[PDB]
Amino acid sequence: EVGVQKCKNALKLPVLEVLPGGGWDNLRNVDMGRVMELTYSNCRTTEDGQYIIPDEIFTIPQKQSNLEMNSEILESWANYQSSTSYSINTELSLFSKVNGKFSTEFQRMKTLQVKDQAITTRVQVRNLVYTVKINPTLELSSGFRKELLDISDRLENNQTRMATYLAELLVLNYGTHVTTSVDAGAALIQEDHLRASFLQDSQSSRSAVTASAGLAFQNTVNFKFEENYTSQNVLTKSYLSNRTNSRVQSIGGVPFYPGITLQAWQQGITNHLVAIDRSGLPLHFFINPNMLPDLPGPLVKKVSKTVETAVKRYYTFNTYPGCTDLNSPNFNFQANTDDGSCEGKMTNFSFGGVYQECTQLSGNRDVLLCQKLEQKNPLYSPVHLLSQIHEEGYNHLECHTVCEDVFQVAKAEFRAFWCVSGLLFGGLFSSKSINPMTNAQSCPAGYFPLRLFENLKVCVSQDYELGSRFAVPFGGFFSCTVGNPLVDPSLKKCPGGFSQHPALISDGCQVSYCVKSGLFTGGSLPPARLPPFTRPPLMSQAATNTVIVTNSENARSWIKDSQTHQWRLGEPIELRRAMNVIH
Amino acid sequence: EVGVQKCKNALKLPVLEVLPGGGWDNLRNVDMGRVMELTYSNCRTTEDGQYIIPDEIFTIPQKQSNLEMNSEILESWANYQSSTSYSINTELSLFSKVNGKFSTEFQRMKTLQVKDQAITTRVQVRNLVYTVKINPTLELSSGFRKELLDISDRLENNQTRMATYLAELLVLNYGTHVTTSVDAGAALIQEDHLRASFLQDSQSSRSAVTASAGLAFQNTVNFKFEENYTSQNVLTKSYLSNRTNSRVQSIGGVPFYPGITLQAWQQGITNHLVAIDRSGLPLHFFINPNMLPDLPGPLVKKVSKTVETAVKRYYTFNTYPGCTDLNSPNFNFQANTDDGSCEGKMTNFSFGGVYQECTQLSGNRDVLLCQKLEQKNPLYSPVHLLSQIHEEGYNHLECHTVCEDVFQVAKAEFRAFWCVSGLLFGGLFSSKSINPMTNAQSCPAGYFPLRLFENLKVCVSQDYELGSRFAVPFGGFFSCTVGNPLVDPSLKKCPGGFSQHPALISDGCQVSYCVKSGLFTGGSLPPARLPPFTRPPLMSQAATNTVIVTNSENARSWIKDSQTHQWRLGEPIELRRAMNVIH
Amino acid sequence: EVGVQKCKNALKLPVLEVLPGGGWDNLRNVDMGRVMELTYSNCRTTEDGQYIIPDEIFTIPQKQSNLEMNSEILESWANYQSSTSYSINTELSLFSKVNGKFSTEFQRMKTLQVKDQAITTRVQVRNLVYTVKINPTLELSSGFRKELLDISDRLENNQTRMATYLAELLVLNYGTHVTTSVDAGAALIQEDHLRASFLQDSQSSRSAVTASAGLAFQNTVNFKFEENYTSQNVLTKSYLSNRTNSRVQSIGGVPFYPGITLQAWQQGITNHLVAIDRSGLPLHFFINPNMLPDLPGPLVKKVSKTVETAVKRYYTFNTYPGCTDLNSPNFNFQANTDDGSCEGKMTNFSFGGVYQECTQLSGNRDVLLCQKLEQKNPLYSPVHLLSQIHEEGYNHLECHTVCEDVFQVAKAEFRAFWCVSGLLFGGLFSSKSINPMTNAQSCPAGYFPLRLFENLKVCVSQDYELGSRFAVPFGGFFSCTVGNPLVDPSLKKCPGGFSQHPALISDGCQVSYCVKSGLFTGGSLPPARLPPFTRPPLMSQAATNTVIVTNSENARSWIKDSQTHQWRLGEPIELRRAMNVIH
Ligand SMILES: *[C@@H]1O[C@H](CO)[C@@H](O[C@@H]2O[C@H](CO)[C@@H](O)[C@H](O)[C@H]2NC(C)=O)[C@H](O)[C@H]1NC(C)=O
Ligand SMILES: *[C@@H]1O[C@H](CO)[C@@H](O[C@@H]2O[C@H](CO)[C@@H](O)[C@H](O)[C@H]2NC(C)=O)[C@H](O)[C@H]1NC(C)=O
Ligand SMILES: *[C@@H]1O[C@H](CO)[C@@H](O[C@@H]2O[C@H](CO)[C@@H](O)[C@H](O)[C@H]2NC(C)=O)[C@H](O)[C@H]1NC(C)=O
Ligand SMILES: *[C@@H]1O[C@H](CO)[C@@H](O[C@@H]2O[C@H](CO)[C@@H](O)[C@H](O)[C@H]2NC(C)=O)[C@H](O)[C@H]1NC(C)=O
Ligand SMILES: *[C@@H]1O[C@H](CO)[C@@H](O[C@@H]2O[C@H](CO)[C@@H](O)[C@H](O)[C@H]2NC(C)=O)[C@H](O)[C@H]1NC(C)=O
Ligand SMILES: *[C@@H]1O[C@H](CO)[C@@H](O[C@@H]2O[C@H](CO)[C@@H](O)[C@H](O)[C@H]2NC(C)=O)[C@H](O)[C@H]1NC(C)=O
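Output (structure tokens, whole complex):
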């Protein structure tokens, strides 16, 4: 009787199913959450008189219908068009070469080009109908507003590392962007993968290749699967023979089956409309004093700085520099960002060994952390590489039968070294990784592991006749703070010929290691690594109540009242009586 | 008149049958339970106006329809795609190489590749319709909330080993994950199994193999079973002759029969939609102070640590390291995880014998446990391998005719040894296993059993002329705490050439044994071993009432009131009057 | 019961969907916002009796239908007709050569001509129906009026750099123009791309080329896709062979499919009408004392000067001077504006290095900005090029447990130099750009970066044997204030042979740099750079209340009352009593 169903009973019209305002993940092109609030109170319609739209939504009739007769050749996977999220992946940002490179449509296309030495062609029937946009005066959703107040409460009780944790659960549920405009329509695409040596002789007749690819697309749709085709004349005999893959997907409308008139596909697009393009803005753009009137001024500029840090950390991880030229050696298959590390010679290095010590600062009673946090050399110059503090909580139970239990914490800082007539290297495996020497979390035969950063193992053998089959050279560790001195004989990268691999993200700082195997390189493409990148804190910090919030340079002060009402602006006679009881 | 039927009478629409929120087992890809609460109060619909959805559910119209013309070749069973649970099996976890490897679809595919030396190809018509997701603000179900309170009660009456038992009945009923997003659709798949020597000569024309496999798939669907096919031209004469198996399964829609137009299959998908992909989060992620407001803070971080231990124990069991290379010898067929134990030489070892002693600490009266818990040598260096305590309860009946009965417990710790001119080895069989030397729970001819770990038998014969037909060599016992010293002449694995096998899980710790038979290896694939991995306790621990719960480091205290009301936060004037009567 | 639905129930007529009054972006031909208010109170109709129009709207029946039998040849992309926004892109302005050159239809056409050496021909069926215009007496919208009052409030509290920021969020949401008249209709266009050497021999028979192009267009529409064509006689055998691309788009009406009678397309245009031409006026034209009666006179002439500056800044950026002649060398592909920089010789220049110093004026406590704002020479005459001040805010927390937090600001002015036996040049990459030497944000091998303008890196190597593969020459920096002295051996442009590229827009002033690579030139076309071009201010300026507003030269004064009522005109007896308490 309220909301949609009140409008839907009076009008008896469908609701437009393609709406802006939701969140958007831009590494993996998926949408998530609902940032903006959508209400159906005035019973608005599209001025066709055909759909029902919310109140803060205006549509623009496009009624456009493209129809292409030539496929387009896109040879490299580095410059990637998306066909559904092209306007939002190509924004001007620092990470424009990482957007969209963890999606379903991209990971298939990179696989089919590398494993077959192939080039791809697509041809398309696109058919845009509306453009749906949001008004500039707009209200946040009920569930998204409550999660911004919780980050503000943790920042005003001096609880960092809990506000940081709640900011990374905001990226996980709402993405990195907000879509401000979509495009309702229905596409129909065919992608083929031709052998790359079929293009190189037909450099003059490249226009004859793509003319037959768009010719075969309209035989596939118009003719039923039995061969009544009109394309097999001259070069639709090697086009069929140099191709390595073919698929046809429809995105809106009715489902596609071979042999359906393009007349009949285009008459089922009504009431089956999806978003075939979209654009938007980053997520921290919508955190400003205009959208949040209840909080003070400089407090929402501190929440918006926390969310901006969590988004940029999510792009800093899931970024793999390496070599990208396919015909060159040292080709890294997991790398999504070029480095210039191609055509670079190598030089062998000898590492003496790794060792690890612990400190055991506070928790001397009832918990002994400083036995597994220590690792000594099985057999140069060591480097420190990390200063990491490990905290653990335990439980007493004082009984008196009534009892009580108290929870302490136990700190133990550890230090992990490596030496710059030497131990061999057999790979690494962690609690989120495997060793690709064995395709399993095990060192090979003869090798023995030893812990280095409290979560991963270091496959090492001291021999020179039996473990020489799995021995791969080593290039050096570095971190987010200290680069290795092996490059520039500093910078944070591998030397030439080597490739880096992530290992052991530890509280907003990952360390890396350089190898030269060729076996760590290949395999399947890695998935995206989702936030939170930190385990939850133990609530060890005490809450410090803040009552008055001020800034010095325009003489504005916000006084929180009793009862936790709200934040009102401080009149200059009440803050005069509130600072004496404070100071 | 309430719930679904109120909405269903007014709207007269079907309910969408593919919903998130339920649990999910990730070793065996099955779903179980219902973790989240789903209510039908606002009578929401999908904005098509076609289905009825719950209140805390938003759908995303995809309306996509893939159609592939080439089969895909996947040669090894180690890297396994699932076609229905691919997004959730490939999560970043420690056990990513164990997910999905106890399901129906996997165990068939591993069988057909090993027993035939075959490779598999699949081709597919996929047709995704909606994407159904859950809101981030969400309530737990009524039945799942009551089972989390019962684990908290056992932890606050100092009843460990009963809270551990109730946590493993939570994994049995609700799985290891919670699905947060599903994909409603309908697939149509054909899998074939070609001989592996048919690929190796057609390395150049591998693109001609897969083009005919996708050609035969559309003759099978479009043509009725009588041969009107258009594929038998050149190489659809050995493709039919090198294949070893073929099946066609449909997953949604109407049932498949040979000869049905793809037009007609795609018009029955409405109202017959199933989940063709899903993704989710682990089960202990949803146990936090946000979801459970009634319990104290550090108490639900102790329940969530108990459930995380029970899930990781369920992946630690059902994990079989071994050799995986098929053409290599020492191939273990039951192994689902590689080890590097391939291409390893063997060395014979002589074991003197096993013997077992008991202690009989407490139950000296009316129960004699220390006669069957003892086993002496029928005929080096012994090792202890286990310190296990065995508890049994009995019953007095004091009569006075009125009577009364009291229940005691009887403890008897046992120790089980083995010796590091020697007894022969004929296999083992237990109360959950058989001896594969006989395919039965019996020692072979000449062999006599003797107990070792109070539940299994040790087939042993002292002869050298008659029991030499069933004698297999022996590689050594180890446990979850002590590895054997026979490897690295320590580590917890077999030496080279040998294979390990589970035996006698005893209270969260299994022991293993290394053999070299080739007969223990083969057979059928083992099923998953389901929790609980411990028999129920005898309630021997006394309940210790806890009233006040505090943590030291933010000065918060929770005071339980009388009557077992609930846990309220302790004001600093009531805990002042509650600690004096306590301490 | 009000608005549209009251008129729509009584009349039972559709609403005309093509209306003026909305905003319009003129670089990218898209429409956005709604500047004018549209009300449906009198229930007016089009005097056909066919549509429903708003009250302040008059339509003109055209009922015209063009039909062309010859394609038109447009060879160069510099003079670009738009076919949907031709009347509004060709206005008399300073930036008439930049209008429409960031749209979807233009960027495709520039790509297909450069990459193929092609010329384009279009043929069209146009069919104009109405002309819809706005009355001269007209009211602003509710949402656009509220955003003009907010710019006026920031200008009367002496808050510049916040009123400048709110003016650039007005261009982002409402564009650069307002459409005052549209044209409802439905076009049907075919564009082809012929090889440019096919025109040059048929200079006499250019009329035979375009006669067959309009002949093939009516075989495509009238005949179904099977070849029943009547065009293949003499020169529809090389016209089919010299063409490189072909598409057919419809803009209004029903969707196009090959084989539909032109009879049948022209009977579906009713109720499917879109804007096929439009014209309008700039956005600051509609900010005058007539439209805003509440504000004073000289105050709305100050708001309208602020918005005019933000629009002209948006055209000053997104303007790329360079070479445009395609067959000439030094061809810049990203350039949209000619320069005369073609056919110009080059001269090598040696730059010693770049260095950077900081000042740290105010924020000496708790924040050290003057360590990363400094960069020293790794190894002439330096020039200053910029004087930029960097402000950052921090947070104290004075505790007393009650606490309070104060927000300061920290200023640190920096200076960035470059020298007019020399460092090599390897490219630049920034926080909104990449290095095109690597197609990634990385310096090549041997090169090391060093910061220059607090956001970008300068790829530099001091060697002469290894980094000679990626070394490109350098032409000099300049800015919006200082041109380089290398041209005219001043002007703000490159010397001959070089090309400029944008880098580091910093608060309404960009700096540029001249290179000569040929690799920085190519690639994909850049998207439009959208406002705001400045990060939000930190509210450091104090609000200065203004009460009376006067101008000297007609003796008019506006007195703001109490309560923030409004601005009334000052009677000469109240301002007499208001200036004494003021002065
Ligand atoms: C507010 O939180 C910060 C962050 O932890 C506290 O700063 C640290 O406090 C510890 C405790 O003495 C010191 O050992 C560290 O050196 C401090 N680090 C920094 C960067 O200041 C701070 O003390 C807290 N303030 C209050 C009043 O609790
Ligand atoms: C893949 O493409 C190449 C073209 O580069 C094909 O090679 C030609 O095939 C035709 C077929 O009759 C021959 O007449 C030519 O002599 C071949 N060579 C050249 C240089 O054109 C090749 O056949 C294609 N692959 C398959 C399997 O057909
Ligand atoms: C709470 O339960 C624990 C777990 O059993 C008890 O700890 C054991 O108690 C027995 C009985 O004296 C001792 O022999 C063990 O050595 C204890 N083990 C550990 C690890 O502490 C504990 O005593 C119980 N507390 C109360 C008050 O009943
Ligand atoms: C299994 O595949 C092999 C191909 O590796 C088939 O062997 C070929 O069969 C054709 C059939 O006429 C012969 O002409 C070839 O000479 C055979 N050998 C090779 C190397 O191509 C084999 O026939 C297939 N199995 C069955 C049962 O047909
Ligand atoms: C009104 O705003 C202007 C703009 O900032 C102020 O002018 C500057 O004020 C600072 C502060 O003393 C001076 O250092 C600058 O030299 C001034 N610049 C110019 C161009 O005047 C102005 O002072 C403000 N007026 C009031 C009353 O606050
Ligand atoms: C592209 O256009 C040129 C015309 O400039 C074509 O060249 C002529 O092709 C015809 C076809 O039989 C020949 O008779 C002429 O001798 C060719 N030359 C001239 C100067 O007219 C060329 O063939 C076209 N391209 C394609 C692929 O057909």
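The longest strand of chain C covers residues 402-419.
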